[PDB]
């Protein structure tokens, strides 16, 4: 109706104001608190900035186009479409950049985490990310939108041509999903291998320690039946198995301590092995001086290392789940558009792309950007507290 245009324009203005307020609050929480300015926040800022410009550009300029009468030129219309692609693809490309940074920080942690690269490239990536979207969306459709008819002006002219639509669909969405999944799988597999070797090696060390303690308990309660050799045989085996569990001077500290321990057990055994009448009352107590002084350091140190690997695994799992739910929301919002333009390309001359659901789809992509700052504080609750 005639009165519906004003109501829809007011609703669109309210939605744009809400999006702008959310993004401004996110930017303020970023710029005020200096704690969220590390590597874990440089590649996340554009996710709250680019889409922000959408609320300033896409939603308002759409009002004269639909609610009011079209009073803008074609150049203005193109620029709007241009902002729409640049700011849109920027989100998924920043997600890809975050995934690549995490892959470099986890897979190449032996060199990147130990020695961080210069920051002069960080911004060099960020802006490039934007221009990347341009190189994907800027020129191509510009060459293919050369149509004379003015029907569906700010609808892209490169439609109804299934080849470019199919190619772009893949580049904009499928290719990013691949890179993100590859990086996440590499990170998870590397961390599982780092923890599996640790879990097994620490379990083997604990089993050897438990066996050495059970044998030493019997050694302390020596029997008159010359049972020292039967208990020490097991003790020697335990020591030799725990000695070969490699976690340099630090390795020599560990190895030498074990060598001493094995030599102490070897001399303790001598009395029983010789068959000499005197076993010196099973004098292998001195092992307690070596058990709690030399080999205790690694028994405590390696345990802490396993704990470090586990927290890291939980943090990587949280980050992977966050990236996964972000990509899932993006896909759920983007798919209705891709399912209403490459399947309806068979007929587009008259009333083909003109329908309610297609307009709803256009809104849905904008909505992805509306909920983006709503689900952004879900990753870090600092914004919520501040």
């Amino acid at each position: 109706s005639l009165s519906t245009r004003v109501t829809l324009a007011f609703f669109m203005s309210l939605v744009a104001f809400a999006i702008m307020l959310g993004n401004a609050l996110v930017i303020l929480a970023f710029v005020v608190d200096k704690n969220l300015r590390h590597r874990s926040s440089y590649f996340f800022l554009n996710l709250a900035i680019s889409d922000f410009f959408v609320g300033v550009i896409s939603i308002p300029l759409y009002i004269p186009h639909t609610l009011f009468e079209w009073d803008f030129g074609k150049e203005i219309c193109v620029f709007w479409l241009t902002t729409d692609y640049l700011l849109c693809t920027a989100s998924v490309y920043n997600i890809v950049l975050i995934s690549y940074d995490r892959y470099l920080s986890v897979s190449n942690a032996v060199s990147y985490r130990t020695q961080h690269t210069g920051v002069l490239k960080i911004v060099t990536l960020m802006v490039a990310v934007w221009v990347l979207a341009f190189l994907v969306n800027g020129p191509m459709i510009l060459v293919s939108e050369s149509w004379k008819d003015e029907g569906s002006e700010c609808e892209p002219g490169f439609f109804s041509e299934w080849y470019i639509l199919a190619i772009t669909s893949f580049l904009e969405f499928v290719i990013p999903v691949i890179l993100v999944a590859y990086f996440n799988m590499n990170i998870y597999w590397s961390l599982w291998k780092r923890d599996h070797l640790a879990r097994r090696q620490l379990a083997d060390l604990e089993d050897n320690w438990e066996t050495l303690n059970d044998n030493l308990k019997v050694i302390e309660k020596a029997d008159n039946a010359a049972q020292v050799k039967d208990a020490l045989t097991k003790m020697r085996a335990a020591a030799l198995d725990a000695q070969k569990a490699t976690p340099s001077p630090e390795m020599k500290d560990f190895r030498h301590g074990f060598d001493i321990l094995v030599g102490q057990i070897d001399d303790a055994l001598k009395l029983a092995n010789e068959g000499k009448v005197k076993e010196a009352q099973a004098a292998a107590e001195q092992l307690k001086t070596t058990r709690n002084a030399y080999i205790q350091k690694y028994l405590e140190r390696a345990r802490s290392t396993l704990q470090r690997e586990h927290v890291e695994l939980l943090r990587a799992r949280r980050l992977a789940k966050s990236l996964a739910i972000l990509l899932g929301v993006f896909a759920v919002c983007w798919a209705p558009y891709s399912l209403f333009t490459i399947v309806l390309s068979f007929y587009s001359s008259a009333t083909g792309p003109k329908s309610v659901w297609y307009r709803i789809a256009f809104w849905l992509q904008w909505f992805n950007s509306f909920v983006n700052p709503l689900l952004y504080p879900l990753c870090h609750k600092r914004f919520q507290k501040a």
Partner: antibody
Amino acid sequence: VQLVESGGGLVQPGGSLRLSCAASGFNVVVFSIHWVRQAPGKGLEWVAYISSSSGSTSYADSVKGRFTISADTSKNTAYLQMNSLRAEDTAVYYCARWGYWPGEPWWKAFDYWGQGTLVTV
Amino acid sequence: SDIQMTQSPSSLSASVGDRVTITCRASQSVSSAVAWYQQKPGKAPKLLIYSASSLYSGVPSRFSGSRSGTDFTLTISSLQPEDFATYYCQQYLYYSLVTFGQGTKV
């Protein structure tokens, strides 16, 4: 190095038999010597161990009580004497070298075996 | 007690140039203390695989081995006329704990 044996011969049951193992260049104190017997057409069987250092001698389960092994560092040789033979010790005796615990000498044991000697009861 | 070394094969025959796998086990767990030896009629036993999976200088790479728990494996990928002899397993966990295996004829 070759640990040659020169105690080949035939003895009567219960009589004393003397064997000799000689080092061919390696110090006997830095490397202990172990004896292993092999019955004709049977598996290898351990006999005894001698160390010129720490003076530790250990015998097997079935040969203890009638075997005496002694090593002189100056002679660089090891002598094994069988005080009593019960017709079950008829075998070929070899002497091989063993390494002490520190380092790779332990992990590599029983290398550079000797030709052997025939002991018939 | 005396740890017993059981060699699973006792007699085996294979064509020249085939895979031969010999298995040895011990009652009590041993850690890299089982070595493989080769004896020919009229010669002395020779060390080939020491430790658990490693070769001493003087033996070609064809001879190999592996360890898993208390199971030790001798793997000969390529047979040749020279390598036909009895193979013995030997545990050297201690000086007074030496126990040779049964022996496998190849």
